[PDB]
């Protein structure tokens, strides 16, 4: 089960929560473990690659400028 935090960004409360996020992660993590074996036989590795690439073209185009936004911002403060 995920935690419905108010602040979207890694706020003080969100950071502290991180610990609990690991427990809820393992819950469904097991399915992934067996799935590892699943995707072994199937050659979806190459498909999902380009698959996520196409979607990320528009999606990542926002988080790219956004992510680098605060990064560049730290350039002035640090340097």
- Alpha-helical regions (H) of 1-79: 12-41, 44-78
Q: How many domains does the chain have?
A: 1
End-to-end Cα distance, the chain: 41
CATH code for the domain in which residue 52 is found: 1.10.1440.10
Q: Are 14 and 6 in contact (CB under 8 A)?
A: no
Query: CA-CA-CA-CA torsion for 47, 51, 52, 57, nearest 10 degrees?
Result: 140
Domain of residue 28 covers 1-79
- State the Cα–Cα distance between residues 4 and 58, nearest whole angstrom: 26
Closest CA to 19 of 3, 30, 40: 3
């Amino acid at each position: 089960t995920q935690q419905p935090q108010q602040d979207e960004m890694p706020s003080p409360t969100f950071l502290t929560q991180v610990k609990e996020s690991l427990s809820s992660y393992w819950e469904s993590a097991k399915t992934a473990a067996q799935n590892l074996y699943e995707k072994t036989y199937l050659p979806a590795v190459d498909e999902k690659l380009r698959d996520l690439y196409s979607k990320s073209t528009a999606a990542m185009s926002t988080y790219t400028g956004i992510f680098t936004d605060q990064v560049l911002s730290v350039l002035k403060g640090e340097e």
